[PDB]
Amino acid sequence: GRFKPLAVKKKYAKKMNQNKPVPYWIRLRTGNRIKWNEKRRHWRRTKLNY
Amino acid sequence: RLASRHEKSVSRAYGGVLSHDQVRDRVVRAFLVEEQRIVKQALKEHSKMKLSHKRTANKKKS
Amino acid sequence: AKRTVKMGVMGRYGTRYGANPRKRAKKLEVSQHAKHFCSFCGKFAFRRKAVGIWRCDGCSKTVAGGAYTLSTPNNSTVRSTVRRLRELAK
Amino acid sequence: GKTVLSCRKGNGSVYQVHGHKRLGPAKLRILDYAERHGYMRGVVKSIEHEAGRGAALARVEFRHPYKFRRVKELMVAPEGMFTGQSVFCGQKAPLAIGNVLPLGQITEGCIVCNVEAKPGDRGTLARASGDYCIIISHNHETGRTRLKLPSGQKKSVPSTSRAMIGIISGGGRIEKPVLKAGNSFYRFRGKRNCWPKVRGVARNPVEHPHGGGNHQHIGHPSTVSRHSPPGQKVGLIAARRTGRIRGGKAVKGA
RNA sequence: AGUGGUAAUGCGAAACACUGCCAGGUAACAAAUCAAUCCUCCCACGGUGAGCUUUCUUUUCACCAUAAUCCACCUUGGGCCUUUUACCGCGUUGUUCGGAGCGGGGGCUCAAGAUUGAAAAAUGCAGCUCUACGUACUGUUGUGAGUUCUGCGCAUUAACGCAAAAACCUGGGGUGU
RNA sequence: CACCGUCUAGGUUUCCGUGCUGUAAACUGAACCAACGGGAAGUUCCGGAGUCUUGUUUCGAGACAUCUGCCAGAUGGGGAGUUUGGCUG
RNA sequence: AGAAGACCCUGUUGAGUUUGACUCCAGUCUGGCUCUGUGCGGCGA
RNA sequence: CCCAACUGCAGACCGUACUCAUCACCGCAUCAGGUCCCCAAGCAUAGAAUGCUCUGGUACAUAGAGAAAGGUACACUCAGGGAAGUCGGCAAAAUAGAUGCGUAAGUUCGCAAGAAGCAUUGGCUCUGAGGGCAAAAAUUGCCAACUCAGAACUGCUUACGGCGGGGAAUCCAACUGUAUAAUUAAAACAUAGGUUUGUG
RNA sequence: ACACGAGUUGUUCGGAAACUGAGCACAACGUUAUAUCGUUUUGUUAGGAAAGUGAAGGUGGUCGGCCAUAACUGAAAAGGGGCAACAGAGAACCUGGGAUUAUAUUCCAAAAAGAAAUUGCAUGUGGG
RNA sequence: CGGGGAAACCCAGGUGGAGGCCUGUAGCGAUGCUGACGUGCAAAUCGCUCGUAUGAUUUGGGUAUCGGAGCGAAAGACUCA
Ligand SMILES: NC[C@@H]1O[C@H](O[C@H]2[C@@H](O)[C@H](O[C@@H]3[C@@H](O)[C@H](N)C[C@H](N)[C@H]3O[C@H]3O[C@H](CO)[C@@H](O)[C@H](O)[C@H]3N)O[C@@H]2CO)[C@H](N)[C@@H](O)[C@@H]1O
Ligand SMILES: NC[C@@H]1O[C@H](O[C@H]2[C@@H](O)[C@H](O[C@@H]3[C@@H](O)[C@H](N)C[C@H](N)[C@H]3O[C@H]3O[C@H](CO)[C@@H](O)[C@H](O)[C@H]3N)O[C@@H]2CO)[C@H](N)[C@@H](O)[C@@H]1O
Ligand SMILES: NC[C@@H]1O[C@H](O[C@H]2[C@@H](O)[C@H](O[C@@H]3[C@@H](O)[C@H](N)C[C@H](N)[C@H]3O[C@H]3O[C@H](CO)[C@@H](O)[C@H](O)[C@H]3N)O[C@@H]2CO)[C@H](N)[C@@H](O)[C@@H]1O
Ligand SMILES: [Mg+2]
Ligand SMILES: [Mg+2]
Ligand SMILES: [Mg+2]
Ligand SMILES: [Mg+2]
Ligand SMILES: [Mg+2]
Ligand SMILES: [Mg+2]
Ligand SMILES: [Mg+2]
């Protein structure tokens, strides 16, 4: 809805900026470990509940 | 709050508090209840002074 | 015409609640909704507001007293007793 | 094995009074110097109903004894109390209905209400609707007044404790049948949570001492001792005698 | 140092200016009945465009709009004043009212509207006409039905009697003297 | 054991009184922020508005329990723990 | 098929409930001293 | 220094997208379950019933081809008989709107009662009543919005939807109400009424 | 769905600032081996000196015996703080828009498309 | 308002809109089919029928009462399957 506290809005804003994939040049480093992001949250599969 | 005082009152005593039928019922009892005590106060001092010559006139009677 | 034989105001309740408990309630449902005599204002205008609270519709006088009738018969026994006992002190 | 309902009402959680629409406590005005020596006069402005009483209240207006103000005083009214009445209150007050004066000054055989069991506690006896006390006698050696309480149980109180004169207002109330469980819903609406009343025999043995069985019977005798613990003291608590009272009418109390 | 009207009560460019203390009112609450506002629906008037047409249909459908905020002030419901006094009368669909002042005659007020205007045509919509989200013009009833806004409360069945407070408003008393 | 001193005044009432200006069926007014006076218009100090404190806020109870703490005994399924043998056509 | 029979029995396995079961515990009551001082006495040994 | 009408300047913080559900929340899921509020058109009709329609929305929930038996249905009929079926009229049938008439025993006189049971109902063309505001005004003008009754004439294949079957008794509980979410809604529980006890 | 790029505009709208309600329980006080416990709206805390505000006047720069602005003395106000309602109380803005791909009673700039209402502070004009 | 009566009072036509009244939507429940489903749409649902629907009525948000305890118109029911 419309009401949220700003401290809940700023937690919901962090998770939008974390919901981005691994870039391709990460996959080209020397001691690489990361193929995919393992933390890709989708709004329907798993709920944050802030 | 933004209106003049005249939309909320009237030009006489207790105006905007009491009506015309009971501003006058207080004027009438501020006169008649004050003056009824004056009748009973002046009756009280007239009684005690009549006592002051019902028995002090018995100094010349025995 | 006349609409019921002997259930008056109690015809509200229909075939419920027993014949005699409707009749004990009938003398007091008639009494509280009847207009009593404003001895202050000369009129037959005391209507009961709430339980024990009466109000002259002509005189706007509010009199405490009596749950279903304006003056209960124990009050008039008391009013005579107080009136007699203040005559023995004067 | 579980706690009895009568024990649970002493926690007083769901079972406290329903007081949001109640007015203040109804009491007599403060026993000040102005009543120990003279009379205060007031004036009745309104006759009031609060939820959970059957007696009418009254706001009486005094002047404050010491300050330039007026004191709104919520008293419980007697019958015949009308708005405008000029209640008098104190020692030198006359003997009229509505006035409040000490029991030493009220001559014997007089119906009084709002009588107080100790001087100054502002009215504790005879305040239910239609009730009154009767003054039996005075004792001037001890300075105490002996009066008949509304149960008939006599009680000697000090003669400086004051009382109002009259029947308590709102009398005649119990004489009309309720006829409905709906009308008993709203009677107990402004009082407290104590209705409907489930019988003990209708319960299980975990909830009540009378509960259980294949027939709804109290097993043991239902007259319990004075010394029973809470939980066991249900039924007819310390009954001196039971059965349909055939004969007179004994006053009930110690 | 406010001021008119017998009175209900009136008059606001800037003194009818201020509030230790006090008392009121507002906030503040309530059925059903009847009457019902904005608005909706219908009907009636017409104008513009569209749809139908072997036959019929002065025809069917769409549209026809007016926000706050001011300003000036004809109704129908409350309260009241003054004058005539009336104890049968006035009035409601309805359970009632009157010498504690009915009804008439004149009024003073309040509440809900109506009306003229400023806003506002400059806007809106639908048409259409001319050599590019272009232009010039043309159009802007109802004693019908439903509406809880209101009338409306010391206001409901009631042993049911229907929150509070901030904030504000007026007076009393005082100052100005 | 006598006296003295602390120890003063007073509404009302014909010595009594015991702190007092109002009421004696009741019918919705008002009451403030001292007027005034005395002794030395402005001060200060008094009265108006009595003084006095072997002291308790006031009333009631009172060495009781309507108080506190420990022992002591009755009661006590209100509650706790546990038990309710075996052989057996 | 479903599910280590919800009937019955066994176990020195439970648990809810009951009660003049066995052992106790809060609560209520009662006595003792205490808190607890001051006077004039009276019944006592 | 107070005040009026005006003027001059400034008016800070956070929320604001989208959803609110036969896909956005909860039930493990885009689950036939649940989930508070506001606006609410036309016609039939007593109508927020029910049936259909302009506005808005939708054609998305695996489809195609297609006469088995057997099923399941918010699907129907069935001659003669008419509960003989069955633990039991279970399931279905039947009754049905409106108006006029009529209605028993019992009764707490309120009811029972829509008791029971009879009759009428279309379409069409007319005739009567039921009113307003504008000038013996007991009458001349003009006009809206509907409703009921009567009458000829004409037709019925009894023809949408929606909508009680009824009667005679016995048991139990007075009544409306509550109540084992997920096998028991009862005669249980509550209730008013009645009594008792403790308490100044 | 996935990737990329965007998107939520307020003096007046909702909240808070700033109300009280059912209630909560900070301080104070008591309790507890233990505060992580109790009391804490029946007008209202706490054996309980919780008011830091200031009438009137005196003191001495200002405006025509009234104001107003600065520092001493002291009438009068019993009853400490803070929460709890995005449906109760309270609340000054309404239309038009060719202004979006998506926001608007929120954006629109000199003909604000415009018409207002309201708060704080200030000049000038005028009045006492 | 009318009628009867010597009176006490009766008799009739309207008005009015009372009720834990009745039929019946929504809402709130859940009677019967012992219907459908029963590796379901569903760890309790679907369908028709049924109870009630101005009241002891339904409901949102807020608050308050819990583990030998809470709350209970009482079914040992309910206290996040
Ligand atoms: N101190 C323990 C507390 O006592 C109270 O409970 C006490 C009260 O319930 C009850 O008090 C009663 C009293 O009701 C009754 N009206 C008078 C009686 N004197 C008192 O009794 C109690 O108090 C006195 C005080 O000295 C003691 O002498 C007596 O032994 C004691 N039983 O006795 C109980 C034991 O003292 C609290 N309710 C409770 O919180 C706690 O147990
Ligand atoms: N009071 C002591 C307790 O008595 C219990 O046992 C007692 C009970 O079993 C039983 O008590 C019964 C009681 O159940 C029953 N309901 C009433 C009966 N009055 C009692 O009886 C007991 O008490 C009374 C005195 O009051 C005596 O007259 C009687 O002799 C005695 N048997 O009698 C036993 C003797 O008292 C328990 N053993 C235990 O809890 C404890 O010892
Ligand atoms: N005060 C006026 C009086 O009215 C009277 O008129 C009254 C009478 O004519 C007539 O009275 C009747 C009468 O017919 C007959 N003889 C007796 C009957 N009781 C009366 O009936 C009257 O009372 C009954 C109550 O019982 C009412 O129901 C009814 O309203 C009324 N008609 O009805 C009228 C009352 O409404 C007479 N004109 C006369 O006595 C006088 O003028
Ligand atoms: Mg209404
Ligand atoms: Mg046991
Ligand atoms: Mg779903
Ligand atoms: Mg047959
Ligand atoms: Mg994505
Ligand atoms: Mg029904
Ligand atoms: Mg059982």
Side-chain angles (χ1 to χ4, degrees), chain A residues 1-34 36-44 46-50, chain B residues 1-24 26-44 46-47 49-54 56-58 60-62, chain C residues 1-86 88-89, chain D residues 1-140 142-248 250-254:
Chain A
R2 181 194 62 82
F3 162 68
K4 65 191 76 64
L6 183 59
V8 179
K9 184 180 175 182
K10 289 180 74 66
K11 289 181 73 74
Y12 273 143
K14 185 184 184 181
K15 295 293 178 289
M16 285 174 68
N17 296 324
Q18 287 185 351
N19 205 357
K20 292 185 280 188
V22 184
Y24 66 99
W25 58 265
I26 290 292
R27 284 189 290 274
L28 295 175
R29 296 180 298 179
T30 296
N32 191 20
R33 295 288 301 163
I34 305 166
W36 294 109
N37 202 9
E38 284 191 354
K39 290 183 175 182
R40 293 301 308 277
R41 181 187 58 82
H42 183 67
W43 63 268
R44 179 168 276 170
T46 176
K47 300 293 186 183
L48 292 170
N49 299 118
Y50 292 156
Chain B
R1 182 176 62 86
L2 296 173
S4 174
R5 193 185 68 186
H6 294 170
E7 288 85 6
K8 293 177 263 75
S9 67
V10 82
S11 296
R12 60 187 171 188
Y14 295 93
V17 175
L18 297 175
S19 64
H20 67 282
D21 54 351
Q22 63 190 359
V23 169
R24 63 96 57 213
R26 294 166 70 96
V27 172
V28 170
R29 71 179 68 245
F31 175 71
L32 294 178
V33 180
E34 290 292 329
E35 289 292 327
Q36 184 179 0
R37 287 191 293 269
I38 297 170
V39 173
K40 191 174 181 179
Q41 182 66 41
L43 189 150
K44 184 175 175 66
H46 191 276
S47 179
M49 292 176 71
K50 187 176 180 179
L51 185 65
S52 177
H53 293 92
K54 187 258 180 64
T56 62
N58 291 321
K60 294 180 182 180
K61 185 267 292 179
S62 180
Chain C
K2 187 178 181 182
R3 296 185 292 257
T4 54
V5 174
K6 61 178 179 288
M7 285 180 71
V9 68
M10 303 306 289
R12 175 178 64 242
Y13 287 149
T15 61
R16 289 183 298 276
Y17 309 126
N20 284 328
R22 290 194 299 263
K23 292 178 185 178
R24 286 190 295 273
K26 188 175 186 292
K27 304 185 294 293
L28 300 163
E29 183 72 25
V30 169
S31 180
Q32 66 182 358
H33 296 288
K35 54 180 78 70
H36 289 78
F37 175 71
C38 170
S39 68
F40 297 95
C41 70
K43 300 182 185 176
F44 281 96
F46 268 115
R47 299 296 288 268
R48 184 178 68 87
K49 302 296 287 180
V51 58
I53 301 173
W54 293 86
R55 185 170 174 85
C56 201
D57 289 330
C59 46
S60 293
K61 190 65 60 67
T62 308
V63 173
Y68 299 131
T69 183
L70 170 61
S71 183
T72 56
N74 209 167
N75 193 13
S76 64
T77 309
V78 168
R79 299 190 59 84
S80 298
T81 301
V82 178
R83 186 181 296 116
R84 176 174 58 83
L85 267 58
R86 75 167 73 95
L88 297 174
Chain D
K2 290 175 72 70
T3 298
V4 178
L5 179 63
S6 66
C7 293
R8 276 161 41 214
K9 293 181 180 180
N11 293 113
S13 64
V14 175
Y15 305 103
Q16 291 181 356
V17 299
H18 292 167
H20 186 271
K21 296 292 179 69
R22 255 133 134 127
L23 298 175
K27 23 227 247 124
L28 295 175
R29 68 180 296 277
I30 298 170
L31 184 62
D32 56 352
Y33 187 84
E35 292 182 353
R36 294 193 296 268
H37 293 278
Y39 68 95
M40 290 298 290
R41 66 176 294 275
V43 60
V44 176
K45 294 288 182 67
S46 65
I47 303 298
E48 295 291 327
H49 179 74
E50 70 181 3
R53 289 183 183 270
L57 295 172
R59 288 184 178 92
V60 181
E61 297 293 326
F62 295 93
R63 291 173 64 246
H64 188 273
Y66 305 106
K67 300 293 180 68
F68 180 73
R69 83 168 74 112
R70 289 182 180 177
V71 178
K72 275 73 69 177
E73 183 68 28
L74 182 64
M75 294 179 182
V76 61
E79 297 190 358
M81 178 170 282
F82 59 93
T83 59
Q85 191 180 5
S86 69
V87 175
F88 293 179
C89 227
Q91 184 179 3
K92 296 189 288 185
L95 193 287
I97 295 172
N99 291 326
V100 178
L101 70 162
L103 292 173
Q105 298 296 319
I106 302 169
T107 58
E108 291 84 2
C110 183
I111 291 92
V112 297
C113 65
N114 287 320
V115 58
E116 67 185 6
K118 64 179 71 65
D121 63 355
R122 297 179 68 184
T124 60
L125 298 172
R127 338 169 61 221
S129 67
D131 291 331
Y132 66 99
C133 294
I134 302 166
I135 296 171
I136 298 168
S137 64
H138 292 89
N139 203 165
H140 295 89
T142 61
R144 296 182 69 88
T145 301
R146 183 174 181 269
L147 57 85
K148 182 179 178 180
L149 294 174
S151 66
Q153 182 173 359
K154 271 65 184 299
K155 186 175 175 65
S156 179
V157 296
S159 66
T160 61
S161 67
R162 65 259 177 94
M164 189 180 287
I165 295 170
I167 306 299
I168 294 295
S169 176
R173 193 182 71 247
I174 307 299
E175 293 294 329
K176 186 174 75 174
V178 174
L179 296 177
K180 295 194 287 184
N183 294 322
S184 180
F185 182 79
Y186 294 106
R187 183 263 185 91
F188 293 102
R189 187 181 69 187
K191 291 182 182 292
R192 73 276 180 191
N193 191 1
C194 63
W195 188 76
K197 294 181 72 67
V198 179
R199 301 153 335 186
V201 294
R203 299 179 185 177
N204 294 113
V206 68
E207 299 301 334
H208 190 77
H210 295 173
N214 292 321
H215 294 87
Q216 291 184 357
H217 68 283
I218 305 167
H220 59 279
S222 67
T223 58
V224 293
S225 179
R226 178 66 69 194
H227 300 92
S228 295
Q232 186 174 0
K233 190 187 287 186
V234 298
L236 296 175
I237 296 169
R240 294 181 180 93
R241 53 133 338 249
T242 55
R244 181 67 177 86
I245 299 170
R246 285 242 140 306
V251 294
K252 290 172 93 288

